[PDB]
Ligand binder design. Sequence first.
Ligand SMILES: O=c1c(O)c(-c2ccc(O)cc2)oc2cc(O)cc(O)c12
Ligand SMILES: O=c1c(O)c(-c2ccc(O)cc2)oc2cc(O)cc(O)c12
Lengths: 109, 116, 109, 116
Amino acid sequence: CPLMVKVLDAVRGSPAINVAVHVFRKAADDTWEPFASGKTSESGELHGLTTEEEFVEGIYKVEIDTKSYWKALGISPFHEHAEVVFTANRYTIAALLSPYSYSTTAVVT
Amino acid sequence: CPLMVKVLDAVRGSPAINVAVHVFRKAADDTWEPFASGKTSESGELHGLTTEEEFVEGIYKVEIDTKSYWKALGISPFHEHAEVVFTANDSGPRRYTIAALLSPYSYSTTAVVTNP
Amino acid sequence: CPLMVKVLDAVRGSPAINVAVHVFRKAADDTWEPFASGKTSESGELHGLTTEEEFVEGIYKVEIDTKSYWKALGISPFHEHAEVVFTANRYTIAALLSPYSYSTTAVVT
Amino acid sequence: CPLMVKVLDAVRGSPAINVAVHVFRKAADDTWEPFASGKTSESGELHGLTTEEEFVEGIYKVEIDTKSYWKALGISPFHEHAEVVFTANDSGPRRYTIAALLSPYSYSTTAVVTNP
Ligand SMILES: O=c1c(O)c(-c2ccc(O)cc2)oc2cc(O)cc(O)c12
Ligand SMILES: O=c1c(O)c(-c2ccc(O)cc2)oc2cc(O)cc(O)c12
């Protein structure tokens, strides 16, 4: 697929499983229009978000619902979510998660 | 001050100087209202954004203009910006340091939260 | 395999390809004995380092030759290498690379 | 001072206090010779490790005892330690800040290098 999301748990040394992910595309309004969503799998991956035809050049945002994930683990987190915003010009967006920290990386091949 | 932003360049091993930072607070109607803004200094720090009085409980967004920083250095980076969104002061007033470490295709953000 | 190494390039948004990796096992001497090595593939992965039988409990070190990688790219780096040292009690050791920074993460499933 | 170490806890969003740090320098015979040591403070900083005179050109190793820090907090972490290995001062004297951000199954290290 044109776009993949991968999430990791730095506390537990594991894939971050069942994490909600929402993808938005910026409308001509300058508002975000919902585009695709899903939850990460047991391998911490989310696949099948979009297709090559659909995934045109644009400014896209991916919101990962980190706070819900931490809440289910009974660990109190800092962020509301982790947002990745990029201009789409294969994208793997990877996120590594900690309660008071996250990093996000793009692997574009 | 209650909120501080610090930015680092992971490519040069330096502070990230002259980076724009825009801060927003979630309104009653769920909109993001402009709250404060500034540029990082020679040390890559931004101080004086707000005050103990002004910085009330709320959901806040700190948006760091990473793209402009990379572009001025000749790089076309992946991200539009780095944005940090968090609930502040709901246990009482705290001091927040929002740190960001920048790479062209990656960034990390960390919060150091302390009690006056 | 029991042990996998994965390397990413934060400057280029890509797998870190052809990066030298050496694995050591701590001897009763308190010295490191060479154990396995390889170079990362076009996908930035290094597989087939060891086998379950061979990979007994121990304290292991994985040295990733980051400086050579940066040198080939004509970007001057800070570290001599990135070293990961752990007690082995499936391990994926992932490294994300920048010239003056790296992070390493373990995913243990 | 020429070399400073700073450590942060990515789980609690605080400085990592009372963390042991051991510094080594590569000898002529290729062995690692003990060079300096200390513990991080309340701010998670370690200052005063060395001096402009002492801190000559060389390959240096900074080993941060992450395992003991996690264990005292009840966590069994992945890493034995975080170790940073670098060539120092070969362009002339510099000031080095070695920063580490800690998680139980992950860590990152960054260097901020500046010119007196
Ligand atoms: O892309 C990936 C990635 O980034 C990480 C990772 C490494 C360091 C980080 O800081 C964050 C994530 O693990 C991965 C593991 C995979 O099997 C595949 C990947 O593509 C990634
Ligand atoms: O100098 C600092 C620094 O380099 C970092 C840092 C940022 C991102 C990381 O991933 C790791 C460390 O945090 C800091 C946090 C502070 O409150 C004060 C600092 O001076 C630093």
